[PDB]
Design an enzyme around this catalytic site. Structure first.
Site, PDB file in Angstrom:
ATOM      1  CG  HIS B  41       0.867  19.460  18.492  1.00  0.00           C
ATOM      2  ND1 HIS B  41       0.666  19.369  19.859  1.00  0.00           N
ATOM      3  CD2 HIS B  41       0.453  19.078  17.129  1.00  0.00           C
ATOM      4  CE1 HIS B  41      -0.273  18.774  19.382  1.00  0.00           C
ATOM      5  NE2 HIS B  41      -0.659  18.849  18.621  1.00  0.00           N
ATOM      6  N   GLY B 143      -5.760  13.824  15.277  1.00  0.00           N
ATOM      7  CA  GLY B 143      -6.844  14.658  13.906  1.00  0.00           C
ATOM      8  C   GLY B 143      -6.593  15.415  15.893  1.00  0.00           C
ATOM      9  CB  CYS B 145      -4.435  17.282  19.309  1.00  0.00           C
ATOM     10  SG  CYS B 145      -2.804  15.761  19.133  1.00  0.00           S
TER      11      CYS B 145
END
Ligand SMILES: O=C(Cc1cccc(Cl)c1)Nc1cccnc1
Ligand SMILES: O=C(Cc1cccc(Cl)c1)Nc1cccnc1
EC number: 3.4.19.12
Lengths: 304, 304
Positions: B41, B143, B145
């Site tokens: 993503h 952030g 991730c």
């Protein structure tokens, strides 16, 4: 989302851990620049620990009696001295991995990370607080005595603790990096009892603010209180008295949530008086006191 | 003495963290050898997350669109591919700090350490468990991730988790390092609910053995039970059923303490039925389930 007991990344401290052996005693040392710091009881046999005269025991020790190994390579000891309850072993090589660092002496209620080590090798990292009775509730076994506690401000490691001892009750005692014990403890195999382990009120309040930020709000009550009224209840429950300095440090959490500090005190007062009634806050069935207000801001804002 | 929620030392993983940016999206990547792994993503805008067609979005991306920074130095991307929900970015430089590693897919109930990161920089380390509903209860913000979960066996890092998502309830979901989600979750901004978060029974038993080893013995009862009888109570309390495989793994803790596994099950059954009555075990007012039997042995024996 979520709130965890989080330690600082330990890499900068792992790069400093060494093994120190003197005779048949092995423990951990901290290598910063060309100095290795370690508990002075590395010079003792188990018999010596009953009533050690460290200055006298040190007369029988030379530089070559201190065996310092970093990884699997031996460091050359070119000097040694005792500062309070730590030894400082001067080596001929500066630690190439020495981070930016400071030595700080923390106050009760302050938290820090511990890198528990054995034989100069890291076993794990966890978060601790200096208790109000100047003990820490760590996880340490025989051989962990080199291990240090620290905080990090971006790239600077502030070392605040070196582990020395377990009390007969299983709580822990140690020194700052100048070798001064926290609390009244002495490095001797004599029974030493700890005082009242009171709850760090300002940290519980910080954690209730973390709980509100993370959605756990059931405990928010319709009341307010004053510092004096709250403190009458804090005294009764073995909580530390709350001062205006504590209220000041909670200001950013109060601002971020819109919950006045004294209103959060009133919610805490009701939790103390009513209990949890089988409910949890941030997955805990007790009020957590090992997060400072700075820890909550750091974790809730993603500081690196 | 003492028992703490302990994470693995994070240094070996800190040496692998990088920042990955694609367009206006920035997250963390894991750099091992000449490959950077990150959630796919990273190619999405916030609008794309509503219903992303990743293969289609990836057609608009070239190697030069993925900006990879290790520390403050840019890495050259020479290839990219999608494997399940992760991207693998081939870079022209092998990570000089690549530890010995494996990619493992863990089972529910298994614990691991998380190095939470932002912008390729570590913020902290904590211990997690893969829940029985395949979520984790982490501490992650926007952030985070890139962040990974891992275990270490002496010098080998087994990476088991990469963080991708927070559910609307604040629990977390992610993938193994082959990009396969744990559980039924998908990388899309659509409401996804988690199933029952049951208690990991074998881990609670392991933690009661850690409690006995550390002196907390009040809960030891005069009873025994059978697996079938215990499981009738486990079902009623939303605990995972205990199998003979779990009893087998608890064998070393049973041997070290002299408490038969089924006797510890009977002590747990009484704790479930009677509650704690305001008492604590290892400083907790609830039964802790995020220590495996291996974690207890490792911590209680000082494995490095
Ligand atoms: O307490 C000691 C040895 C000792 C005895 C007496 C005085 C001193 Cl300074 C040190 N070791 C240990 C064991 C388990 C956890 N933490 C530490
Ligand atoms: O959840 C996301 C972004 C996102 C949205 C939808 C799908 C996916 Cl794969 C990722 N970020 C985040 C924030 C707070 C804690 N952990 C993660």
């Amino acid at each position: 989302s979520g709130f965890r007991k989080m330690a600082f990344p330990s890499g900068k401290v792992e790069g400093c851990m060494v093994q120190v052996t003197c005779g048949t005693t092995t423990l951990n040392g901290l290598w910063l620049d060309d100095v290795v710091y370690c508990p002075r009881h590395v010079i003792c046999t188990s018999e010596d620990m009953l009533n050690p005269n460290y200055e006298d025991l040190l007369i029988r020790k030379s530089n070559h009696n201190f065996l310092v190994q970093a990884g699997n390579v031996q460091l050359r000891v070119i000097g040694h001295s005792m500062q309070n309850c730590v030894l400082k072993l001067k080596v001929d090589t500066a630690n190439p991995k020495t981070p930016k660092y400071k030595f700080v002496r923390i106050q009760p209620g302050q938290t820090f990370s511990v890198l528990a080590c054995y034989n100069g090798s890291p076993s794990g990292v966890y978060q601790c607080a200096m208790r109000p009775n100047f003990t820490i509730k760590g996880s340490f076994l025989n051989g962990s005595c080199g291990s240090v506690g620290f905080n990090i401000d971006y790239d600077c490691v502030s070392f605040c603790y070196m582990h020395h001892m377990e009390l007969p009750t299983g709580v822990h005692a140690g020194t700052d990096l100048e070798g001064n014990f926290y609390g009244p403890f002495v490095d001797r195999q004599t029974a030493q009892a700890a005082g009242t382990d009171t709850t760090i009120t300002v940290n519980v309040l910080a954690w209730l603010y973390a709980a509100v930020i993370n959605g756990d709000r059931w405990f928010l009550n319709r009341f307010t209180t004053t510092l004096n009224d709250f403190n009458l209840v804090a005294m009764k429950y073995n909580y530390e008295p709350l001062t205006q300095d504590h209220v000041d440090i909670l200001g950013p959490l109060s601002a971020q949530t819109g919950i006045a500090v004294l209103d959060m005190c009133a919610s805490l007062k009701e939790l103390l008086q009513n209990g949890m009634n089988g409910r949890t806050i941030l997955g805990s069935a007790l009020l957590e006191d090992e997060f400072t207000p700075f820890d909550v801001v750091r974790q809730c804002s993603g500081v690196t």
